[PDB]
Amino acid sequence: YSIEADKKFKYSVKLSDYPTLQDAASAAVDGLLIDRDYNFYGGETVDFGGKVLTIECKAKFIGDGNLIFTKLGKGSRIAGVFMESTTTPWVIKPWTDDNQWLTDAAAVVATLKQSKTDGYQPTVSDYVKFPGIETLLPPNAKGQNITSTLEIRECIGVEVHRASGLMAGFLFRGCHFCKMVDANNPSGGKDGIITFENLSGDWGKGNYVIGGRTSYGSVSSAQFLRNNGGFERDGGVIGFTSYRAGESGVKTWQGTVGSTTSRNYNLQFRDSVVIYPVWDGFDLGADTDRPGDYPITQYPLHQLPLNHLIDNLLVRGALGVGFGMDGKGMYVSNITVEDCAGSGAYLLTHESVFTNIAIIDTNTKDFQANQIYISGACRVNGLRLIGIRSSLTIDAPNSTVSGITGMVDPSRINVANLAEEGLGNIRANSFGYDSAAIKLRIHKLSKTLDSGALYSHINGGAGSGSAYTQLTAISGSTPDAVSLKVNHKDCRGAEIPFVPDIASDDFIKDSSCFLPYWENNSTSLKALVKKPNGELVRLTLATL
């Protein structure tokens, strides 16, 4: 029987049969079943001998600190891991029972409680976010560092599926071609919830976050350090959801970490959602010398050829900035940002294109100077502004924009050039008003007053079948001060404005034209005429 059995059954070793995780690992050949809770000590390391194993977790790993898995064979997969700290830390909860953000340090301090979820351990960035809190927090709530972390170290082709936990963290250190798939809403701890760190060895590649969901955590939910997806864009975040990040939903690190660059290139950031982060929805910047990276003499600050593939992202309820990034020659598309407390988008980009961007009701707490800020010479094609709420809305000094929609206040727009070059035949439709209008505003003259208009006003009331058209010009900072009318009171004639006094030679502009003016002392209308030959002559036009 032994021979028959050895050839017909699936091999799998189970934790309940061994005293330590390493004993189970050494015995493993194909599958490995975690069938009983295991208390690990921080730094406990397991060597898997290069075996390609399938780890099925049906119990939890308990402990503060890291449980390090090493030498897992390419193709290995861990499913259902549950990480839980042994410590129940002090957590703050900066939001109310109506889901309103609390921004007052005292009100935030009052939310203190010992829990492994539904809040997060204060971190030094909170001292900045809620000014004064550093002084108000009791010593036992400061400097906490609890996280139950599964650290996958220097492995390749290892995937972690349906992970979860309380005060949980997942760290891939020096890994390549690894994936965090369908994270089953782990509640984060002090550290990042999903981190791909490649500060040593080669630049990380093939590392992805696919289809997850995370909640809380003191810092960013998903973060990358020194990763480069290459031209193939092999790496990034796709179909992921982040709830209530203590810092940001997804973040690519900036600047120098240790003695090398922590920046990232050629990653995908698509079809993902970030809701209610204490800081940003997406923090895709690289710059904040650059050892280990491009020199400033080659690429100035904020002008790195990051080349990320960014598309179809949704952000809602950030206390900070909805979407932020930097870079040169970037193409960004289909971004939707709604109901944020800080800027909806903060863009330190140059020579980049933004297509179909919707920034709806953001900067609601006036944390910044505008709803959307663009640094360099960029192009925006399709920009939706204003939802249900009423600083500048958009300040993009060197950018050319087209296709803005929404109830934006014109005085709150600052761009280099705004234009609709390719519209077809047009119709202005007016509702709930006695007139329709097409207004012109030269922002160089005034950002608050229209300089001229073409109106249509009703004569009589509804259903009269009559209206008058008037062409206006501003004078003395009084809009519509001067104007020519056609059909006022259904008279069917043109009412024409004349100079109220003797017209000066320079008033008339073109040849073959005449400018009527008033001669009060003779009660006559005169006409300054500039003949077709350019010569001026004054004629009598109308008299008693």
Could you list the active site residues? 247, 280, 283
- Shortest approach of a second copy to residue 60 CB, angstroms? 10
- In the set 259, 427, 521, 534, which binds a second copy (CB under 8 A)? 427
Tokens at 123, concatenated: 């971190």
CB 147 within 8 A of CB 120: no
Q: Which residue, 69 or 253, is less far from a second copy as judged by CB?
A: 69
Q: Which of 114, 113, 90, 105 is nearest to 136 (CA)?
A: 105
- In the set 25, 166, 284, 415, which binds a second copy (CB under 8 A)? 415
Tokens at 375, concatenated: 């640094």
Residues ≥6 apart with Cβ < 8 Å to 544:
523, 524
Handedness of CA 217, 219, 225, 227 (dihedral sign): positive
Q: Which residue, 298 or 477, is less far from a second copy as judged by CB?
A: 477
* Residue 406, φ and ψ in degrees, nearest 5: 120, 165
Residues ≥6 apart with Cβ < 8 Å to 475:
481, 482
CB 220 within 8 A of CB 283: yes
> What is the four-CA torsion angle of 33, 35, 40, 46, rounded to 10 degrees?
-10
- Shortest approach of a second copy to residue 260 CB, angstroms? 22
Stretch that binds a second copy, among 108-116, 125-133, 167-175, 358-366 (CB under 8 A): 358-366
Residues ≥6 apart with Cβ < 8 Å to 359:
322, 337, 344, 345, 371, 372, 383, 384, 385, 394
Could you say whether residue 458 binds a second copy (CB under 8 A)? yes
- In the set 116, 161, 308, 441, which binds a second copy (CB under 8 A)? 441
Could you say whether residue 36 binds a second copy (CB under 8 A)? no
Size of the site for a second copy (CB under 8 A): 190
Could you say whether residue 541 binds a second copy (CB under 8 A)? yes
The number of CA neighbours under 13 Å toward the Cβ of 327 is 25
Residues ≥6 apart with Cβ < 8 Å to 6:
none
Q: Which residue, 199 or 394, is less far from a second copy as judged by CB?
A: 394
List the interface residues with a second copy, window 296-335 (CB under 8 A): 309, 311-312, 314, 316, 331, 333-334
Q: Which residue, 136 or 416, is less far from a second copy as judged by CB?
A: 416
Could you say whether residue 522 binds a second copy (CB under 8 A)? no
Could you say whether residue 352 binds a second copy (CB under 8 A)? yes
Site string for a second copy, 200-229 (x = CB under 8 A): ------x--------x--------------
Please give the helix or strand (H or E) that residue 377 lies within, else none.
none
Could you say whether residue 496 binds a second copy (CB under 8 A)? yes
Could you say whether residue 49 binds a second copy (CB under 8 A)? no
- Shortest approach of a second copy to residue 142 CB, angstroms? 26
- In the set 61, 276, 323, 373, which binds a second copy (CB under 8 A)? 276
- In the set 255, 256, 466, 519, which binds a second copy (CB under 8 A)? 466
Could you say whether residue 493 binds a second copy (CB under 8 A)? yes
Could you say whether residue 19 binds a second copy (CB under 8 A)? no
- Shortest approach of a second copy to residue 265 CB, angstroms? 11
**How many Å apart are CA 431 and CA 429, to the nearest integer?**
7
Could you say whether residue 289 binds a second copy (CB under 8 A)? no
CA angle 158, 245, 124 (to 5 degrees): 110
Q: Which of 316, 397, 309 is nearest to 364 (CA)?
A: 316
- In the set 86, 153, 471, 519, which binds a second copy (CB under 8 A)? 471
Site string for a second copy, 103-122 (x = CB under 8 A): --------------------
- Shortest approach of a second copy to residue 86 CB, angstroms? 20
CB 416 within 8 A of CB 400: yes
- Shortest approach of a second copy to residue 107 CB, angstroms? 17
Strands 250-252 and 256-257 come out as: unpaired
Site string for a second copy, 159-198 (x = CB under 8 A): --------------------------x-------------
CB atoms within 10 A of CB 505: 9
Could you say whether residue 127 binds a second copy (CB under 8 A)? no
Stretch that binds a second copy, among 1-9, 42-50, 219-227, 319-327 (CB under 8 A): 1-9
List the interface residues with a second copy, window 234-273 (CB under 8 A): 234, 239, 241, 243-244, 268, 270-271, 273
Could you say whether residue 48 binds a second copy (CB under 8 A)? no
Could you say whether residue 500 binds a second copy (CB under 8 A)? yes
CA angle 350, 355, 359 (to 5 degrees): 95
Helix (H/G/I), strand (E/B), else coil: 188: strand
Could you say whether residue 505 binds a second copy (CB under 8 A)? no
Could you say whether residue 2 binds a second copy (CB under 8 A)? yes
Q: Hey, which residues does 283 pair with through a beta bridge?
A: 251, 324
Tokens at 28, concatenated: 């493993």
- Shortest approach of a second copy to residue 85 CB, angstroms? 19
Amino acid at 223: Q
- In the set 192, 339, 343, 371, which binds a second copy (CB under 8 A)? 339
- Shortest approach of a second copy to residue 139 CB, angstroms? 30
**In 433-472, which positions are buried (b, 16+ CB within 10 angstroms) versus exposed (e)?**
eeebeebebeeeeeeebbbbbebbbbeeeeeeeebbebeb
- In the set 275, 286, 341, 345, which binds a second copy (CB under 8 A)? 275
CB 61 within 8 A of CB 32: no
- In the set 403, 519, 534, 536, which binds a second copy (CB under 8 A)? 403
**How many Å apart are CA 107 and CA 94, to the nearest integer?**
8
